[PDB]
Amino acid sequence: DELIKKLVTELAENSMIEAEEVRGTLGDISARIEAGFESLSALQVETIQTAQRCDHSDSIRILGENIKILDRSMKTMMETMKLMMEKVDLLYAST
Amino acid sequence: DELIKKLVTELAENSMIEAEEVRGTLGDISARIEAGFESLSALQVETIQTAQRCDHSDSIRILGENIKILDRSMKTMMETMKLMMEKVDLLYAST
Amino acid sequence: DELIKKLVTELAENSMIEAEEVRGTLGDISARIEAGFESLSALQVETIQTAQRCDHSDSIRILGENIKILDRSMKTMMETMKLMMEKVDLLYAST
Amino acid sequence: DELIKKLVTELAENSMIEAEEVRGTLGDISARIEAGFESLSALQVETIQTAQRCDHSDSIRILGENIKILDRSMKTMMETMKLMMEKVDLLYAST
C-alpha cells in the first residue's frame, strides 16, 4: 500500500477544494435563513403591537354608558315637562 | 478486478466522511427551516387572534341605535314644549 | 487508456449513489421552503382580511354627525325654553 | 508522477459535472429563500399599514367629549326647567 496511499492523498487534495466551496455555499444559505426569519419576526411583532392599539373595548363601553346616562336624563326631563304642564292645566281651569 | 476493488474501498473510506459532514449540515439547515416556519406561524396566529379584538361592528351599531333613540326622544320633547307653549298663549289671551 | 476508462466507470458507479441521495435531500429541503412560504402567506392574507374589518372610519363619523345633530336640537330647545319663560314673565307682570 | 496526474484530470473531468449540477441546485434554493422572504415581508408591511387605519383613539375621544357637552347642556336645561316651574308655582299662588 505504498503507491496506493500516494494516490489517495493526491485525490483528496483536489476534492477538498470542492468540499470547502460547498461548505461556504451552505453557510451562505444558512445565514440567509436566520436573517429572513430574524427580520420577518421583528416586523411580525411590530404588527401585533400595532393591532393592540385598535382594541377600543373600554372606550366604546364608556361612550355607551354615557349615552344611557343621557337617555335617563331625558326620561327625568320628560317627567318634569308633564309635571309643568299639569300645573299649567290647573292654572287655565282656575280662571 | 482484485486490486481494482481494493482501491474502490480505500477511496470510498475517505469520501464517506465528507458525505456524512454534508448530510449533517443539510439536516442542520432543514431543522432551521422547520423551526423558523413553526415560530413565525405561531406569532402570525397570535396576530389574527389580536386583530379580531378590534372588530367593534356590533358595539358601534348599539351606540348608533341609542343615539337615534335620544334623537326620537328629543323630537317627542319638542312636541311637548310647543304643546306647553300653546297652553301658555291661551292663558295670556284669557286675561 | 483501456484500463484507465474501466476505473473511471467503477468510481462513478459508487459516487452516483451518493449524488442521488444528496439530490433527494436537496429536493426535500426545497419542498419544505415552498411549503412554509405557501402556508405562512395564506395565514398572512387572512391577517390583512381580518384587519380590514376593524376600520370603522365611516361608522364612527356617522355617530359623530348624529351627536352634533342632537347638540343642534339641544340649542333649538334652549331657545324654545327661554321663549316659554319670556311669556311666563309677561303673564306674572299682567296680574 | 507522469501517469498519476493523467488519472487526476480524467477523474476531475467527471466530478466537475456533478459539482456544477449541485451548485446550480443550491442557487435555485437560495433564490427561492430570497423570493419568499421578499414576498412575505411585503405582505407583512401591507398588514401593518392596514392595522394603522383601525386606531380610532382620537375619533372615539371626540365622540366622548361631545357626549359630555350634551350631558352639560342637559344639566343647563334641567336648571332652566325648575326655574320655569318656580315661576308657575308663584303664578298659581297669586290667584
Author numbering:
A (entry chain A), B (entry chain A), C (entry chain A), D (entry chain A): 1 to 95
From the primary publication:
It self-associates in oligomers through a central oligomerisation domain (POD) and bridges the RdRp and the nucleocapsid. Here, we used X-ray diffusion and diffraction experiments to provide a complete structural analysis of BoDV-1 P. We observed that P possesses a modular architecture, consisting of a central oligomerisation domain (POD) surrounded by two disordered regions, similar to other Mononegavirales Ps. Using X-ray diffusion and diffraction experiments, we revealed that BoDV-1 P adopts a long coiled-coil α-helical structure split into two parts by an original β-strand twist motif, which is highly conserved across the members of whole Orthobornavirus genus and may regulate viral replication.
Crystals belonged to space group P4212, with cell parameters a = b = 35 Å and c = 166 Å. This informed our choice to use a single coiled-coil chain of the measles virus tetrameric POD as a starting model to solve the structure by molecular replacement. The monomeric POD is composed of two consecutive aligned α-helices (from residue E73 to Q123 and S128 to A164, respectively) linked by a short stretch of three residues, making a ≈ 140 Å long molecule. Considering the electrostatic surface of the domain, the break seemed to separate the N-terminal acidic region from the C-terminal more neutral region. In addition, the Ramachandran plot showed that residue D126 fell into the β-area, whereas neighbouring residues (C125 and H127) were in intermediate positions, between the α- and the β-areas. As opposed to the trimers, the tetrameric motif of POD identified herein did not form regular β-sheet main chain hydrogen bonds, and the shift in the helical axis was limited to 45° instead of the 120° observed in trimers.
